[PDB]
Design a protein around this motif. Structure first.
Motif, PDB file in Angstrom:
ATOM      1  N   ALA A   1      -2.970  -8.585  11.182  1.00 44.97           N
ATOM      2  CA  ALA A   1      -3.722  -9.829  11.059  1.00 44.97           C
ATOM      3  C   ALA A   1      -2.793 -10.995  10.758  1.00 44.97           C
ATOM      4  O   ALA A   1      -2.925 -12.072  11.349  1.00 44.97           O
ATOM      5  CB  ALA A   1      -4.791  -9.694   9.974  1.00 44.97           C
ATOM      6  N   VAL A   2      -1.836 -10.796   9.849  1.00 40.88           N
ATOM      7  CA  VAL A   2      -0.885 -11.855   9.524  1.00 40.88           C
ATOM      8  C   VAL A   2       0.047 -12.114  10.702  1.00 40.88           C
ATOM      9  O   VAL A   2       0.306 -13.269  11.063  1.00 40.88           O
ATOM     10  CB  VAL A   2      -0.103 -11.495   8.246  1.00 40.88           C
ATOM     11  CG1 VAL A   2       0.999 -12.515   7.978  1.00 40.88           C
ATOM     12  CG2 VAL A   2      -1.049 -11.414   7.058  1.00 40.88           C
TER      13      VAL A   2
ATOM     14  N   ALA B   1      -4.348  -5.224   7.940  1.00 38.26           N
ATOM     15  CA  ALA B   1      -3.907  -6.398   7.197  1.00 38.26           C
ATOM     16  C   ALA B   1      -2.583  -6.926   7.738  1.00 38.26           C
ATOM     17  O   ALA B   1      -2.410  -8.140   7.899  1.00 38.26           O
ATOM     18  CB  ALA B   1      -3.781  -6.054   5.712  1.00 38.26           C
ATOM     19  N   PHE B   2      -1.643  -6.025   8.032  1.00 39.38           N
ATOM     20  CA  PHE B   2      -0.320  -6.433   8.495  1.00 39.38           C
ATOM     21  C   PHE B   2      -0.397  -7.157   9.835  1.00 39.38           C
ATOM     22  O   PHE B   2       0.202  -8.224  10.011  1.00 39.38           O
ATOM     23  CB  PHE B   2       0.588  -5.203   8.592  1.00 39.38           C
ATOM     24  CG  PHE B   2       2.011  -5.520   8.965  1.00 39.38           C
ATOM     25  CD1 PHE B   2       2.384  -5.646  10.292  1.00 39.38           C
ATOM     26  CD2 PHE B   2       2.976  -5.686   7.986  1.00 39.38           C
ATOM     27  CE1 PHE B   2       3.689  -5.939  10.635  1.00 39.38           C
ATOM     28  CE2 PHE B   2       4.285  -5.976   8.322  1.00 39.38           C
ATOM     29  CZ  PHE B   2       4.642  -6.104   9.647  1.00 39.38           C
TER      30      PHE B   2
ATOM     31  N   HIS C   1       4.574  -4.986   3.563  1.00 40.51           N
ATOM     32  CA  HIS C   1       3.627  -6.090   3.578  1.00 40.51           C
ATOM     33  C   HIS C   1       4.376  -7.378   3.876  1.00 40.51           C
ATOM     34  O   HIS C   1       5.529  -7.549   3.475  1.00 40.51           O
ATOM     35  CB  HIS C   1       2.887  -6.219   2.243  1.00 40.51           C
ATOM     36  CG  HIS C   1       2.145  -4.984   1.841  1.00 40.51           C
ATOM     37  ND1 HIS C   1       2.768  -3.900   1.259  1.00 40.51           N
ATOM     38  CD2 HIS C   1       0.835  -4.657   1.940  1.00 40.51           C
ATOM     39  CE1 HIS C   1       1.872  -2.961   1.015  1.00 40.51           C
ATOM     40  NE2 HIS C   1       0.692  -3.395   1.420  1.00 40.51           N
TER      41      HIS C   1
END
Ligand SMILES: *[C@@H]1O[C@H](CO)[C@@H](O[C@@H]2O[C@H](CO)[C@@H](O[C@@H]3O[C@H](CO)[C@@H](O)[C@H](O[C@H]4O[C@H](CO)[C@@H](O)[C@H](O)[C@@H]4O)[C@@H]3O)[C@H](O)[C@H]2NC(C)=O)[C@H](O)[C@H]1NC(C)=O
Lengths: 301, 140
Positions: free
Chosen positions: B125-126, B122-123, B32
């Motif tokens: 997206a950042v 999620a990863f 993450h």
């Protein structure tokens, strides 16, 4: 039996007819030793004597506020609440099932941005003797702090005699990191007590999954003499900053009483505007699919 | 020196492909982009190399993960699965940054694939915010 709160105890019961129940031992918090008697709620009936009282808790007639006396001298109180487990499932009577997104959704939470602030809502038909307690944290093994307010009445719908109530609570993460990729979800926990019944609820989520941006702000139209229009808006004030990092994507719609849609990452767009139509714009996080914002409209012409 | 706009496009292509996955007819083990990784807007201004090194590490991890028994073993992926392309685009993005588990039941492997792909959304997206911000503020 476990202690919810000083002098308030919860008794877990497999709720079915001819069930044995739980053998509970109450203790009178007093330095007196002799002459002690026990009663329940407003009944004078002496249920036992001595510093302790053992009871078979089977129904709500065995629940309530137990008081120990030294004759006319009141000593201490023990309030028993029941958490009934029906068909192997903890009761969910107090809160109404919102059935959205899925079944058994009793709490719904929303964020307007990545700040760590969020709001959760729930519904109930109960009007009296109703207490809610809210707690929250990120993670379970080693919980990180989340500060929550008190649940408050936000809305009420009454049709004749049937009354429906909506409650809400605002929470905030203590040390939020808006840009991080969350690995541990937020947990929101709600205790619900109604008369002698105890129920509790939880919702587990990541902020990124409950994002719903506010509508685009300051939506405006600039005409150009084949009757085209230059549509322009701005990010909503509450959205995370800088926008170069926390980007939004937009959908611009033309609709009257047939549709024309354009999808753009810009804050402007050219559309063909007709009589009695309306230009609407809504927004979504550009890199992660969460909820669309509400539309913001301005009349055509 | 990073080539922000190419990374921006590849990470956009990853956001799109990752959200097209649906193998089901929390994710404990992966990486993450954490708070201490310095991939927030101010951290990029001050030390972009430190952030992009931790994005590269996670991309390599996801490549290897997608190219392993979890995804190449049984039950066979369906021909319409996006895993193969994600693998290529993850590999492509990690090269722009620098040129140089395994359950028994098949139902448990499907569930595992779903958690990994959900984690990847999620990863990336950042990462996309990182490359979009750097292209806007750190490019000459
Ligand atoms: C939502 O409801 C559920 C179900 O009722 C509830 O789970 C229960 O939580 C309590 C409180 O943690 C548990 O009680 C503990 O049980 C163990 C044995 O199983 C005891 O060892 C514990 O003893 C300690 O605490 C007592 C006071 O509570 C002391 O008397 C004692 O000396 C110890 O200090 C404790 O009694 C209970 O077992 C669970 N039940 C189940 C089925 O999981 C949950 O906590 C509720 N959620 C919230 C947020 O309250």
């Amino acid at each position: 039996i476990w202690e919810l709160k000083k002098d308030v105890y919860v008794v877990e019961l497999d709720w079915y007819p001819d069930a044995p129940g739980e053998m509970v031992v109450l203790t009178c918090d007093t330095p007196e030793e002799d002459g002690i008697t026990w009663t329940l709620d407003q009944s004078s009936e002496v249920l036992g004597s001595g510093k302790t009282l053992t009871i078979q808790v089977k129904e709500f007639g065995d629940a309530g506020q137990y008081t120990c006396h030294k004759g006319g001298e009141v000593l201490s109180h023990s309030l028993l609440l029941l958490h009934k487990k029906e068909d192997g499932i903890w009761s969910t009577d107090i809160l109404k099932d919102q059935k959205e997104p899925k079944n058994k959704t009793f709490l719904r939470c929303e964020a307007k941005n990545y700040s760590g602030r969020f709001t959760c809502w729930w519904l109930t038909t109960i009007s009296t003797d109703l207490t809610f307690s809210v707690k929250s944290s990120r993670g379970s093994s080693d919980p990180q702090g989340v500060t929550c307010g008190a649940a408050t009445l936000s809305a009420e719908r009454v049709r004749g005699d049937n009354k429906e109530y909506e409650y809400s609570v605002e929470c905030q993460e203590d040390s939020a990191c808006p840009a991080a990729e969350e690995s541990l979800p937020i947990e929101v926990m709600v205790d619900a007590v109604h008369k002698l019944k105890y129920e509790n609820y939880t919702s587990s989520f990541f902020i990124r999954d409950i994002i719903k941006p506010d509508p685009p702000k300051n939506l405006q139209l600039k005409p150009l003499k084949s009757r085209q229009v230059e549509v322009s808006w701005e990010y909503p004030d509450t959205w995370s900053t800088p926008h170069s990092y926390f980007s939004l994507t937009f959908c611009v719609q033309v609709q009257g009483k047939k549709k024309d849609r354009v999808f753009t990452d810009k804050t402007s767009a050219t559309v063909i505007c007709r009589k009695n139509a309306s230009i609407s714009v809504r927004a979504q996080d550009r890199y992660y699919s969460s909820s669309w914002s509400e539309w913001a409209s301005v009349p055509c012409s | 020196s990073p080539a922000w706009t190419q990374c921006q496009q590849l990470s956009q292509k990853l956001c799109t492909l990752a959200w097209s996955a649906h193998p089901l007819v929390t994710t404990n083990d992966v990486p993450h982009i954490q708070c201490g990784d310095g991939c927030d807007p101010q951290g990029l201004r001050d030390n972009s190399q430190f952030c992009l090194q931790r994005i590269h590490q996670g991309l390599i991890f996801y490549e290897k993960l997608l190219g392993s028994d979890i995804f190449t073993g049984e039950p066979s992926l369906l021909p319409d699965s996006p895993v193969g392309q994600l693998h290529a685009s993850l590999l492509g993005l990690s090269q722009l940054l620098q040129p140089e588990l395994s359950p028994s039941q098949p139902w448990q492997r499907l569930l595992l694939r779903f958690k990994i792909l959900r984690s990847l959304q999620a990863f990336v997206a950042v990462a996309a915010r990182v490359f979009a911000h750097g292209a806007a503020t750190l490019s000459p």
